[PDB]
Design a protein around this ligand. Structure first.
Ligand SMILES: CCCCCCCC(=O)OP(=O)(O)OC[C@H]1O[C@@H](n2cnc3c(N)ncnc32)[C@H](O)[C@@H]1O
Length: 534
């Protein structure tokens, strides 16, 4: 029930439920939820086929929570998490939240300098790490005195002084703990539950701080199905806000959360078939895969009911394609930023126009402002989207300048161009910083990208501005064709020439490639793309 308030501000409605917010801390709300689920399955390791009960989660969170306190972790301390999706990941995060510590997950594919830059943003006192990243993490922690200890969820290393094996700690008979642990009370308004590293044009990430309030208010907020009885698959990485908050919310609703370490084409399809996955979180890259890759037909996907996509531009042409190929009833697209905790806009049964991002979630205000002025725009006027509500981040840790630039008067200036129609359904056009500056025009690469993805001969597409002396930027398309097909640069140029405005002309040419660089969250790594121009 969105409302158009005076002044051209859109409102998603008042937040009715207050269960999570009433809690004394996110750690206590998670523990009680898990305990209240009894012995039901809540986590399924798809690769190894191991079901995990709610009581197993509760017991392990209690044990690990005590161990953290013994190791010196105190309320509002920071603990790092560098690991693929796994039960130990969830156990590590929940335990850290149980003791009232900030959890700072770290991208698993990070490099020495990115890892070093991340842990220098949040300054974790203890860091969890699996075998895939322990060597890099231990090596980096050596050059940072604030890191007092590393816990290895798997594997080992000698490049750091104080390393603990999680298995030995959990099982230490000499360390006696009670069957139940209770989380301390949090200043929900200021205590930081999560520090999520966001990608930016800087090349190095910023640390967005999400308070307990941000998370509890989000918890208190797509289809008519009760999520509790849902078998849910999440391939988005859990160190990203989308996958991270999706793991928490799904956990609090008692759903059956199936997971893979990362994403893999065959493992993804295989998981949906074996475990009868009914709903899955996706990023556009996976949606395009479902829509294009021929391997998709080699699997039984009948159990799939809902596809929840977000994090990057997704066109209706791709949505329709997927629905017409595999026959999934519900495809819902959502929009949000790391700075907005989770989504601020989601499609539903009533507001699910093709290619839209839905309507505001309760408690969130939205406004479309014209850049180069604060002019608040009306319906159907494109402008920079700004959001206000209980989901807005507290700010970039240690970077008050970047925070003032982003949050004005409680409004998050997302930096994206969008608009809302007369039903207050929102549409995301593109990111201002990624608009191709060609002869004063601000061409949205996402528009051309959607057009190129309608061509059955194109498997993936990414458009970038090519540096030019007179024009400044010329649209250039990185194209990934399908296997058994013939495609030429001229044919691609002709395609957009006959279906797009003269400004979208691929004057920069075509550059066929077998794979487009994407980040673990499905965002086109434009930075890398501009480097390949050779
Ligand atoms: C249920 C939905 C859960 C979504 C959570 C993901 C949060 C996240 O993505 O955090 P990030 O900070 O990494 O991304 C922030 C930036 O990503 C771009 N963006 C994000 N969503 C869309 C979209 N639906 N359509 C077009 N663009 C999108 C945009 O430009 C934005 O400013």
């Amino acid at each position: 029930t969105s409302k158009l308030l005076p002044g051209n501000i859109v409102y998603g409605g008042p937040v009715t439920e207050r269960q999570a917010q009433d809690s004394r801390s996110l750690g206590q709300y998670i523990l009680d939820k898990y305990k209240s689920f009894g012995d039901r399955t809540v986590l399924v390791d798809a690769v190894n086929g191991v079901e995990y009960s709610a009581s197993f989660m509760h017991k392990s969170i209690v044990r690990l929570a005590y161990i953290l306190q013994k190791l010196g972790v105190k309320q509002n301390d920071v603990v790092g998490l560098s690991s693929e999706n796994s039960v130990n990941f969830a156990l590590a995060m929940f335990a850290g939240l149980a003791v009232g510590a900030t959890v700072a997950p770290l991208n698993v594919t990070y490099s020495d300098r990115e890892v070093d830059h991340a842990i220098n943003l949040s300054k974790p006192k203890i860091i969890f790490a699996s075998k895939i990243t322990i060597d890099r993490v231990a090596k980096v922690a050596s050059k940072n005195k604030f890191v007092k200890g590393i816990i290895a969820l798997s594997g080992t290393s000698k490049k750091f002084k104080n390393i603990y094996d999680l298995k030995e700690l959990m099982e230490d008979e000499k360390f006696k703990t009670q069957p139940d642990f209770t989380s301390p009370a949090a200043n929900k308004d200021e205590d930081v539950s999560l520090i999520v590293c966001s990608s930016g044009t800087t090349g190095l990430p910023k640390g967005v701080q999400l308070t307990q309030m941000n998370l509890l208010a989000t918890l208190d907020s797509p289809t008519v199905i009760p999520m509790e009885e849902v078998t849910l698959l999440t391939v988005i990485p859990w160190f990203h806000a989308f996958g991270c908050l999706t793991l928490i919310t799904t956990a609090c609703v008692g759903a059956r959360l199936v997971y893979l370490p990362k994403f893999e084409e065959k493992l993804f399809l295989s998981a949906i078939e074996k475990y009868r996955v009914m709903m899955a979180f996706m990023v556009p890259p996976l949606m395009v895969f479902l829509a294009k890759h021929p391997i998709v037909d080699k699997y039984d996907l009948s159990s799939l009911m809902v596809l929840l996509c977000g994090a990057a531009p997704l066109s209706r042409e791709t949505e329709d394609q997927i629905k017409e190929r595999i026959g999934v009833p519900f495809i819902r697209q959502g929009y949000g930023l790391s700075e907005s905790t989770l989504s601020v806009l989601v499609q539903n049964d009533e507001f699910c126009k093709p290619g839209s991002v839905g309507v505001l979630k309760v408690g969130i205000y939205a406004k479309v402002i014209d850049p180069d002025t604060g002019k608040l725009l009306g319906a159907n006027e494109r402008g920079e989207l700004c959001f206000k509500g209980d989901g807005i981040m507290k700010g970039y840790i240690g970077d008050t300048k970047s925070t003032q630039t982003a949050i004005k008067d409680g409004w998050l200036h997302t930096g994206d161009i969008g608009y809302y129609d007369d039903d207050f359904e929102f549409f995301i056009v593109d990111r201002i910083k990624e608009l191709i500056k060609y002869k004063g025009y601000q061409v949205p690469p996402a528009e051309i990208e959607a057009l190129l993805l309608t061509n059955d001969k194109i498997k993936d597409a990414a458009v970038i501005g090519k540096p030019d002396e007179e024009a400044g930027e010329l649209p250039l398309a990185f194209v990934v064709k399908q296997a058994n097909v013939q495609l030429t640069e001229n044919e691609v140029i002709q395609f957009v020439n006959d279906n797009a405005s003269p400004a979208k002309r691929l004057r920069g040419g075509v550059i066929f490639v077998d794979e487009i660089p994407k980040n673990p969250s499905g965002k086109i790594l434009r930075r890398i793309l501009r480097e390949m121009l050779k």
